[PDB]
Symmetry: D2
Subunit: 368 residues, 4 copies
């Protein structure tokens, strides 16, 4: 049933992602000293100008200058020409900090969860590849292998598919577009070559690369001092690269800067969890699980399972399987997924879904 699909991802230095990371680093910094710290913060950045905003009720002593600069350094902004230097940039902190199982969902909400068997991660090939492509250039940047590579990058992967009496099989990577920031002493010709051999061919399965696959490497020519200015970076503006790459459904809630008490984060994670568990348990090849909550109520106000005619069990057979194996009440979610743990910054770039190192990515047994 042929159709094509494109997804994108951004590197650790893309301005928006710089902000998502700093906001989550501030969340990690509080969890380590107070796992009940209430965090609600966001970051805004513009060329060596970082603004930290937010209301956080906690009881931990934090050096925000330190957690902001350390995060910029980790991302790789240490020199001047790169567009950012953690040692010299303006970190204006305008953050306000106070001090002091069957909970109940804050804010009516509707979270979505998605999983597909086209990849071992149970994520769309398109977004999986987009993320790995960025992940790989960071590796090469940090190992020393490609020392011209700078932090800011963008990746787009378009794959041709075909349905299958149920749903979704990738056939080939139709085209790949990558742009990455770089140092001056490196030719456009040398960058393009390294991008194809060392990053693309080193992450994309042979099965998908072709004699026709189109490559668009550094299409706009040069991106040197293109460091994060990107006309103002912001938190919460990369909602689709943080999730499914345009593939499931998304209600609009951003993750970074919000602690584990916000259903937007927790519940979204819980819904991914059940979606991944279901395909993993052989119960379907592709699922879109929809969980609704009602302001005040703890127990979900209606969960819906949408297989795309890819399950043998039948929605409202699969619904019992979920109601017998999962307790999606907010509090139980944070307890089961170990959501008080400072794992948030790693979550802030390269996607929240797909990587197995996250609790919600470990499939539950599922006794059926």
């Amino acid at each position: 049933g042929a159709f094509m699909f494109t997804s994108e991802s951004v590197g650790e230095g893309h301005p928006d992602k710089i902000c998502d990371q700093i906001s989550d680093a501030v969340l990690d910094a509080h969890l380590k000293q107070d796992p009940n710290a209430k965090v609600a913060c966001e970051t805004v950045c513009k060329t060596g100008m970082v603004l930290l905003c937010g209301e956080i009720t906690s009881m931990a002593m934090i050096d925000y200058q330190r957690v902001v600069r350390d995060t910029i350094k980790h991302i790789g902004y240490d020199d001047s020409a790169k567009g950012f230097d953690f040692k010299t940039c303006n970190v204006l902190v305008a953050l306000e900090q106070q001090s002091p199982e069957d909970v109940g969902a804050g804010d009516q909400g509707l979270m979505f969860g998605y999983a597909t068997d086209e990849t071992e991660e149970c994520m769309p090939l398109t977004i999986v590849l987009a993320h790995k492509l960025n992940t790989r250039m960071a590796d090469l940047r940090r190992s020393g292998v490609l020392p011209w590579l700078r932090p800011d990058s963008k990746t787009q992967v378009t794959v041709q598919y075909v349905q299958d009496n149920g749903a979704v099989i990738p056939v080939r990577v139709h085209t790949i577009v990558i742009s990455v920031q770089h140092n001056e002493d490196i030719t456009l010709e040398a960058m393009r070559e390294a991008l194809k051999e060392q990053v693309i061919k080193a992450v994309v399965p042979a099965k998908y690369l072709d004699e026709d696959t189109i490559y668009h490497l550094q299409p706009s020519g040069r991106f040197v001092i293109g460091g994060p200015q990107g006309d103002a970076g912001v938190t919460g503006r990369k909602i689709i690269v943080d999730t499914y790459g345009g593939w499931g459904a998304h209600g609009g809630g951003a993750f970074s800067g919000k602690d584990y008490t916000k259903v937007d984060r927790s519940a979204a994670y819980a819904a991914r969890w059940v979606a991944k568990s279901l395909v993993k348990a052989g119960l379907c090849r592709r699922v879109l699980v929809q969980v609704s909550y009602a302001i005040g109520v703890a127990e979900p106000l209606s969960i819906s399972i949408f297989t795309y005619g890819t399950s043998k069990k039948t929605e409202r057979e699969l619904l019992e399987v979920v109601n017998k194996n999962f307790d999606l009440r907010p509090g139980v979610i944070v307890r089961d997924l170990d959501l008080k743990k400072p794992i948030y910054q790693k979550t802030a770039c390269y996607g929240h879904f797909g990587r197995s190192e996250f609790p919600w990515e470990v499939p539950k047994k599922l006794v059926f």
Copy 2:
């Protein structure tokens, strides 16, 4: 095939929407004097602090102080206590302004379009009601009828559905949550009453309100000097309320602040257009049209039509109907949809899809 769904929308004073509007007012201000002005700007705001960023290549003389303050005044921030006064707020302009049919799409892209017959607008009931609810309080604010009403509001509408040998029929509004900023001299009891009688019951069809429908009006109590702070307002962070309320598919591109040359805006509008045309022409009851573009190429690199088994014609019958009635090349899109016109600010709040006053919302004939 019962399921439930929730959508949300925000008023003209919600900080993010304040930013989306100012960005598009700056786009309008340029189009009026140079329809070829190249605009790429964003706004950030935080309590009487508005920052305008961006790169715009144009040849028009614009008073940004004037277009930023006029926009805040239009939204309704003229007094102090409201959280914003266009006469006193800091408008820091950091914008850089330069001077000098078969084009070809910039940036590989994948735009989505959606339409459904559950409402005359051809939009999900859930998001249509969410928007109308906010639209109505603005009317009452502006007429004088509810003079305690301030600009910032948030609305959530959750409707119970049932499929139908094809797709999607709303049955009832299960619950409604609304919070709106307000003046001090007005009781929580008086606000709640006016919200039910004068806004909810004056916009939601009798068929959907019930003796059980749940109302959550000003749940968090008061929201007086609330105003646009939300710790920070940003452009491009309300991507789902600008489109389908979590209903079609969304690849991630924001609209406000980008001119008509960006496929993220134009092509998204074009895809809504054909989706709306298709259901209007009786060819399906619900569609998800997917249009792909390839960097450099003008003609779409693959359009996909997904009816949900609600068309009698059959995808790749309906695809010919689209290829015989539409020319989705970028340049033809801006020409046919009159995209050089300064209509953008009206597009910046209450949704981009649904309102008939926009070119992309006038269904094309469709000769089949």
Copy 3:
């Protein structure tokens, strides 16, 4: 030997003075917990936007949000229309805070000290009156007596003099100009009347007011929402109203935000001290003491005493009196003047010289 002279002073809400006070409040906040805290900070403000900058090496835990807002509240900005509300203004903190007798002067320097017997304070009548005029409207503002009075004011006092076989005798207040911010419900006519009866006539000695004295009260008409925007307030820009009102000599060093280790502050205070001591001890009627320091050296590198032919003893008789009664080495100065004490914020408005409540204003005995 007739001549005329004018001086000015500003109220606690003048933007520059708001900054001088916040910077010194931050200095007080550190001294109370670490009398060796090394403070070097400055503040910038612009309508409900306060930026705290600086490098301070100390070991005290301080809530800068708290010391900034408390200082704005103390000044009297609690409501919206006033141009500032400590509860709602943006306090962006960009401060960096580290942790860990015969000292020796940092930076070559030349401090000046001045005293005159025309007033009991040993300060020029012109600046003394200018300050008292502002001090009095604050009293009336804070008592309740003139409840329309807002924080920001400016005062200028011009007095006609006559020399006297030595130096300087005030004869009459030639003209007085005062502008003070105010609430809307108060007539220009009522403000002008209260300014003459209740503030001017209540602070200026009858001996100096005349049937000709000129009054310029609220000359520019109304100053209501004239709250601190004053197109950006700053620290260190009110160097002459902080000292002698244009009367001694001033080398350029600002006081606020600098701890007691900076010769600019300490030594200036020490020089005022000896100047006041000398006239107090009957040794001259008017003095300009000049103390020089050499980078690295502790003992002053040359002190000069300039009486204006008003001493009977003779410069270099008076120099021995000073060398026998004072040890102006930096460290001894901070020890004798109790300069580790958090008295700095009170120093930040209404002048550093004149008020007896400050150590440097208590005249030393002087054994001659």
Copy 4:
């Protein structure tokens, strides 16, 4: 009558002076297109962050981005490591711009003027040398002769004097302190040597240098990425280096950013003019002319001439010479001194007094 004196001056890249220059470049930019433009602006800066504030009523089209960046480039900030790059720094413009002989002084005021014959410029040796020292390193920076020299510097010159049956004769330069920002590839030993041979000895007259003169070159060691940060740069904070180096009298008014209608600027220039004219006409060796104005009145409300017993004519003989050769009414001052001319930015660094290229520095004939 021996005494010693010290003065200081700062280079074009000292943060405060960066701000004084940008403010005056904005004033120049308006005068060139509207000599009646009413300018009242100030600049604030902090590491690649420049904020332009102010109210200017004018009728000229100005590209503030352009006049701010051109000014930073002129100063010499083009590379990254220098602490500033006009191509990458944040220039946030928050300026508001409107449109539409016997005038009469605005604001009661008291301006001071000073001149002395110890140098051909008729300025204190101490401040003349301090300025020339900075001027010289800029020359060498700009010529290529000392290519390690960066824009930010500070200079202090302390000279030993002796009175003379009238007033003030310099005897020798006691000590000189200079610190200048620099590039990494240059030794402290090489910088110190070049500062003594090529800048100090190339500007200070042999008569004043000695075998004992003390040199303090780059005392704090290195100052590489120093650049303009000083935690913050502001306009109007270098009031004494802009005038007499602590030598005449100063009432407190800053110059930069204020147009020629403000008596603070104009009248201060007028008072320097007569002071310079008087000593030039042989009528005294040292003068302190004091001109007072009354709000509303055009003709000066009392001018006082203080020779220090160095004139043969006698104050109130010299007063007639001034009243017969000068018309210090505000409007006549701007007309005679050609104050509508865009010469202000050159006035913004290296002192307002002393350089003959300025109208107020050309001595008037003086018919006695």
